[PDB]
Swiss-Prot record, chain B:
UniProt function note: DNA-dependent RNA polymerase catalyzes the transcription of DNA into RNA using the four ribonucleoside triphosphates as substrates. Component of RNA polymerase II which synthesizes mRNA precursors and many functional non-coding RNAs. Pol II is the central component of the basal RNA polymerase II transcription machinery. It is composed of mobile elements that move relative to each other. RPB3 is part of the core element with the central large cleft and the clamp element that moves to open and close the cleft. Seems to be involved in transcription termination.
UniProt keyword annotations, A-Z: Acetylation, DNA-directed RNA polymerase, Metal-binding, Nucleus, Transcription, Zinc
Binding positions (Zn(2+)): C84, C86, C90, C93
Description of how the protein assembles with itself and partners: Component of the RNA polymerase II (Pol II) complex consisting of 12 subunits.
Gene: RPB3
Subcellular location(s) per record: Nucleus
Keyword Acetylation attributed: yes
Keyword Transcription: yes
Protein name (record): DNA-directed RNA polymerase II subunit RPB3
Sequence similarity: Belongs to the archaeal Rpo3/eukaryotic RPB3 RNA polymerase subunit family.
BP term (GO), one: termination of RNA polymerase II transcription
UniProt source species: Saccharomyces cerevisiae (strain ATCC 204508 / S288c)
Other notes: Present with 10000 molecules/cell in log phase SD medium.
Effect of A28D: In mutant RPB3-1
GO CC, alphabetical: nucleoplasm; nucleus; RNA polymerase II, core complex
Curated annotation (Swiss-Prot), chain C:
Protein's cellular compartments: Nucleus, Nucleolus; Peroxisome
Start-end of C4-type zinc fingers: 6-26
Known role: DNA-dependent RNA polymerases catalyze the transcription of DNA into RNA using the four ribonucleoside triphosphates as substrates. Common component of RNA polymerases I, II and III which synthesize ribosomal RNA precursors, mRNA precursors and many functional non-coding RNAs, and a small RNAs, such as 5S rRNA and tRNAs, respectively. RNA polymerases are composed of mobile elements that move relative to each other. In Pol II, the core element with the central large cleft comprises RPB3, RBP10, RPB11, RPB12 and regions of RPB1 and RPB2 forming the active center.
Oligomer status and interactors: Component of the RNA polymerase I (Pol I), RNA polymerase II (Pol II) and RNA polymerase III (Pol III) complexes. Component of the RNA polymerase I (Pol I) complex consisting of 14 subunits: RPA135, RPA190, RPC40, RPA14, RPB5, RPO26, RPA43, RPB8, RPA12, RPB10, RPC19, RPC10, RPA49 and RPA34. The complex is composed of a horseshoe-shaped core containing ten subunits (RPA135, RPA190, RPB5, RPO26, RPB8, RPB10, RPC10, RPA12, RPC19 and RPC40) where RPA135 and RPA190 form the DNA-binding cleft.
Intrachain disulfide bonds: none
Name of this chain's protein: DNA-directed RNA polymerases I, II, and III subunit RPABC4
Residues shown, of full length: 26 to 70 of 70
GO-annotated molecular function: DNA binding; DNA-directed RNA polymerase activity; zinc ion binding
From Swiss-Prot, chain D:
Phylogenetic placement of the source organism: Eukaryota, Fungi, Dikarya, Ascomycota, Saccharomycotina
Miscellaneous comment in the UniProt entry for this protein: The binding of ribonucleoside triphosphate to the RNA polymerase II transcribing complex probably involves a two-step mechanism. The initial binding seems to occur at the entry (E) site and involves a magnesium ion coordinated by three conserved aspartate residues of the two largest RNA Pol II subunits.
Record organism: Saccharomyces cerevisiae (strain ATCC 204508 / S288c)
Cell compartments where the protein resides: Nucleus
Name of the protein: DNA-directed RNA polymerase II subunit RPB2
Role noted for this protein: DNA-dependent RNA polymerase catalyzes the transcription of DNA into RNA using the four ribonucleoside triphosphates as substrates. Second largest component of RNA polymerases II which synthesizes mRNA precursors and many functional non-coding RNAs. Proposed to contribute to the polymerase catalytic activity and forms the polymerase active center together with the largest subunit. Pol II is the central component of the basal RNA polymerase II transcription machinery.
Phosphoserine: modified positions: S86
Domain of life: Eukaryota
Whole-protein coverage range: 834 to 980 of 1224
Curated annotation (Swiss-Prot), chain E:
Protein's recorded name: DNA-directed RNA polymerases I, II, and III subunit RPABC5
Function text: DNA-dependent RNA polymerases catalyze the transcription of DNA into RNA using the four ribonucleoside triphosphates as substrates. Common component of RNA polymerases I, II and III which synthesize ribosomal RNA precursors, mRNA precursors and many functional non-coding RNAs, and a small RNAs, such as 5S rRNA and tRNAs, respectively. Pol II is the central component of the basal RNA polymerase II transcription machinery. Pols are composed of mobile elements that move relative to each other. In Pol II, RBP10 is part of the core element with the central large cleft.
A GO BP entry: transcription by RNA polymerase II
Organism: Saccharomyces cerevisiae (strain ATCC 204508 / S288c) (Baker's yeast)
Gene transcribed to yield this protein: RPB10
Key word Hydrolase present: no
Length: 114, 266, 45, 134, 65
C-alpha cells in the first residue's frame, strides 16, 4: 500500500544514470562513484578486486539503506593513476576470471555421467 | 585452463557438487547470489479467469500458477514484455497457456500442471512447457474439484528475474562451504567442554589436511577453496544455472564498463 | 436482470424485481448473484 | 530486528509464507418505515437525486449491486439505494475508504418482514508487510 | 488448504510430492521420516513443508454448492 514496485531494484528510473562520479573532497586523488540499481552482488566483487591492484590506496563500498538498491564505491589511487582506470582494470580483471571460470566449468561438465 | 578452477565431484539432472579453486571469496559469493536472484526465467505472471467454481479463491490459485516451473531453456530468445514494442503481450515475449478442468467423476478430480496447455506460438523456442519430474507424469497439484466444479482460466507466462519475485528463481538451495577445519579462524566455536567432540565433522574434511598442533597460526593464508552444490528446480538444467550465473554476473560487470565509456563523451 | 444461481440448489434463475423470492423448484429463498462477465486479471505474485 | 521487531525473509514470503485471505461483508436493507415509503435498491443518477457519494457508481448493475467479479477500491459505491423523500435521497454504501479488493459474493434475500435486503462480501489477500505483528 | 507448490524456506518443488507422500505412508506402510526421505526431501526446511501440512481442501469439497 506504501510498498515500492519490485522492478525498482533493477530498472533505472526517470533520468537516473547508472554510474555517478564525484571528486572526493576529503583526501586527494580520490573518488566516490554511486551505483544505482545494484547491491552487494556487484559492490563486494568490485571492491575485493580493487584490493589486489597494488596502486590502489583505498577501496570500500556501502549500502546506505537496504530499502534502496544502490551503493557507494570510494576509491583512492596513487599519484598519477586516475581512479577510473583503477575501476576499469578492476572490472575487466573480474570478467576475465569469470570467463575462464565458465570454460573451466564447461570442460569439467562434459566429462561426467548422470 | 588458467585462473579459477572447477572440479565436479557429483553430477545429476538436478545437482552439481563441485569445488571452485583459486577464486576470491567475493567472486565465489557474488556468483551464488547471482545464481539465486538474477538468471532470468519464464513463469506465469498473469491469470485471466473465466470460471472458478472451485473450493479455492481466484488469486489463491493465480498464486500457485506463478509457482509452477515452466521450461526456460531457450529463455534468452524470449523478450521482456517491458522491452517489447507490442502493446501488452505478444508471441515474441510471452507464452500463453490454457487450463480447463471440470469434475466429471464422483471421485475427486485433481488438476495437475500436466493439464496446462500451451496456446501461443512458441515458434520453435524451447520454452513454457511445465517441468514435470513427477514419477507418474503429473507434476504439481494445482487444485482439487468436487462433482459439479469447473475452473477455466488463461495464463500469460513472462520472462522474469527472481529479484522481482521468487517464482522466477531457477535456484532452490545452494550449498556453500570453505575452510572445513577453521584453519583461517573465521568462526570461534561455541562449546561446553570440547569444540572438536561437540561440533560434527564437515564431509569436506576428507578433502583437506587437518592442522597440526605442532604448527602455529597461518595468518597470511586466505580463503581459496570453496565447496558448493547447486540444486536446480528444473526450468533450466543444473549445469546452466551455474554457467548462466557466471554469464550474468560477467554480463552485469560489463554494463558498468560500458557505462564508463558512455560518460566520457563531451 | 440478471441471473441468480440458487444457493442450496443449482440453477440460473434470471428472475427480476417484483418477482421477489425465492427460487425455482427449490422453494427456499437466499439467492447468490452470479460471476460477472468482464473478466479480471491477477498478477501471479 | 531490535527492540521486539523482526526481519522476515522477503523471498520466502513470495512463496506464500504467512499469507491470509481477508473477507469483509457489507449489509443493507430496504427501509423500515411507512406504508407508502420504501427505500429502493437501484443505481441512482445524479440528476435531481443530488446527495450522492464522491465515488463512481459505475460498478453498480441495474439492480443497484456489484457483480461478484468486479475489483473495487477507494470509495467505490457497492450497494446503491435511494430513500424517496417528499425526487430522492442517496443511501448508498461505499467500500471502506482504506480498503480495496474484489467482490466475492452477493446475497440478495428477503427479511422476516418481507424486506428485501442484501449482503455484499469483498475479498482481499493480505501479504505480510513491514510492521505486521507476529 | 492444499499442498504448497513450493517450499518457503528455499522454495523447492514439493507441490508434486503430496500424493506420492500419502502413498508411501499407507500403501507400503513406511514411516513419515522415511517417506519424506524417499521423496528426496532431504534438507529439513522443505521437509517440514510436507510433514506439517494439513489438507483442508478434502474438507472443503465436502460442501455441495
Ligand atoms: Zn510483446
Ligand atoms: Zn434452487
Ligand atoms: Zn526448503
Amino acid at each position: 500500500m506504501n510498498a515500492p514496485d519490485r522492478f525498482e531494484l533493477f530498472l533505472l528510473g526517470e533520468g537516473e544514470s547508472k554510474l555517478k562520479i564525484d571528486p572526493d573532497t576529503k583526501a586527494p586523488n580520490a573518488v566516490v562513484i554511486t551505483f544505482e540499481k545494484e547491491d552487494h552482488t556487484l559492490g563486494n566483487l568490485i571492491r575485493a578486486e580493487l584490493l589486489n591492484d597494488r596502486k590502489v590506496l583505498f577501496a570500500a563500498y556501502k549500502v546506505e539503506h537496504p530499502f534502496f538498491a544502490r551503493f557507494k564505491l570510494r576509491i583512492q589511487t596513487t599519484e598519477g593513476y586516475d581512479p577510473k582506470d583503477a575501476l576499469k582494470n578492476a572490472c575487466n580483471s573480474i570478467i576475465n576470471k569469470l570467463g575462464a571460470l565458465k570454460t573451466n566449468f564447461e570442460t569439467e561438465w562434459n566429462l561426467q555421467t548422470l | 585452463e588458467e585462473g579459477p578452477q572447477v572440479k565436479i565431484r557429483e553430477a545429476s539432472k538436478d545437482n552439481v557438487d563441485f569445488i571452485l579453486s583459486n577464486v576470491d571469496l567475493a567472486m565465489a559469493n557474488s556468483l551464488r547470489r547471482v545464481m539465486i536472484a538474477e538468471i532470468p526465467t519464464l513463469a506465469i505472471d498473469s491469470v485471466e479467469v473465466e470460471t472458478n467454481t472451485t473450493v479455492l479463491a481466484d488469486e489463491f490459485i493465480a498464486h500457485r500458477l506463478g509457482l509452477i516451473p515452466l521450461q526456460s531453456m531457450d529463455i534468452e530468445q524470449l523478450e521482456y514484455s517491458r522491452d517489447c514494442f507490442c502493446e501488452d503481450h505478444c508471441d515474441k515475449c510471452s507464452v500463453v497457456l490454457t487450463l480447463q478442468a471440470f469434475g466429471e467423476s464422483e471421485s475427486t478430480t485433481n488438476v495437475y500442471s500436466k493439464d496446462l496447455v500451451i496456446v501461443s506460438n512458441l515458434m520453435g523456442r524451447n520454452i513454457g512447457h511445465p517441468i514435470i519430474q513427477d514419477k507418474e507424469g503429473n507434476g504439481v497439484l494445482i487444485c482439487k474439484l468436487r462433482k459439479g466444479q469447473e475452473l477455466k482460466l488463461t495464463c500469460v507466462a513472462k520472462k522474469g528475474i527472481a529479484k522481482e519475485h521468487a517464482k522466477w528463481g531457477p535456484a532452490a538451495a545452494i550449498e556453500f562451504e570453505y575452510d572445513p577445519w577453521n584453519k583461517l579462524k573465521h568462526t570461534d566455536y561455541w562449546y561446553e567442554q570440547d569444540s572438536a567432540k561437540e561440533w560434527p565433522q564437515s564431509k569436506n574434511c576428507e578433502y583437506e589436511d587437518p592442522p597440526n598442533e605442532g604448527d602455529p597460526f597461518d595468518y597470511k593464508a586466505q580463503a581459496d577453496t570453496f565447496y558448493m552444490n547447486v540444486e536446480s528446480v528444473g526450468s533450466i538444467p543444473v549445469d546452466q544455472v551455474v554457467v548462466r550465473g557466471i554469464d550474468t554476473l560477467q554480463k552485469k560487470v560489463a554494463s558498468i564498463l560500458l557505462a564508463l565509456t558512455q560518460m566520457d563523451q563531451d | 436482470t440478471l441471473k441468480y444461481i440458487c444457493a442450496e440448489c443449482s440453477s440460473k434463475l434470471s428472475l427480476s424485481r417484483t418477482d421477489a423470492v425465492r427460487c425455482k423448484d427449490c422453494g427456499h429463498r437466499i439467492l447468490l448473484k452470479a460471476r460477472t462477465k468482464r473478466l479480471v486479471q491477477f498478477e501471479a505474485r | 530486528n531490535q527492540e521486539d521487531s523482526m526481519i522476515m525473509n522477503q523471498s520466502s514470503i513470495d512463496r506464500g509464507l504467512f499469507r491470509s485471505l481477508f473477507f469483509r461483508s457489507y449489509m443493507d436493507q430496504e427501509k423500515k418505515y411507512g406504508m407508502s415509503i420504501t427505500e429502493t435498491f437501484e443505481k441512482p443518477q445524479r440528476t435531481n437525486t443530488l446527495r450522492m457519494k464522491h465515488g463512481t457508481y459505475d460498478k453498480l448493475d441495474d439492480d443497484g449491486l456489484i457483480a461478484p467479479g468486479v475489483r473495487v477500491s477507494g470509495e467505490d459505491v457497492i450497494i446503491g439505494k435511494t430513500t424517496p423523500i417528499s425526487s430522492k435521497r442517496d443511501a448508498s454504501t461505499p467500500l471502506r475508504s482504506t480498503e480495496n479488493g474484489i467482490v466475492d459474493q452477493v446475497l440478495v434475500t428477503t427479511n422476516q418482514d418481507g424486506l428485501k435486503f442484501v449482503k455484499v462480501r469483498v475479498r482481499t489477500t493480505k501479504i505480510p508487510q513491514i510492521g505486521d505483528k507476529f | 488448504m492444499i499442498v504448497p507448490v513450493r517450499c518457503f524456506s528455499c522454495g523447492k518443488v514439493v507441490g508434486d510430492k503430496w500424493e506420492s507422500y500419502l502413498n508411501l505412508l499407507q500403501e507400503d506402510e513406511l514411516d513419515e521420516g522415511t517417506a519424506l526421505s524417499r521423496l528426496g526431501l532431504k534438507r529439513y526446511c522443505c521437509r517440514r513443508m510436507i510433514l506439517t501440512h494439513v489438507d483442508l481442501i478434502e474438507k472443503f469439497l465436502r460442501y455441495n454448492p
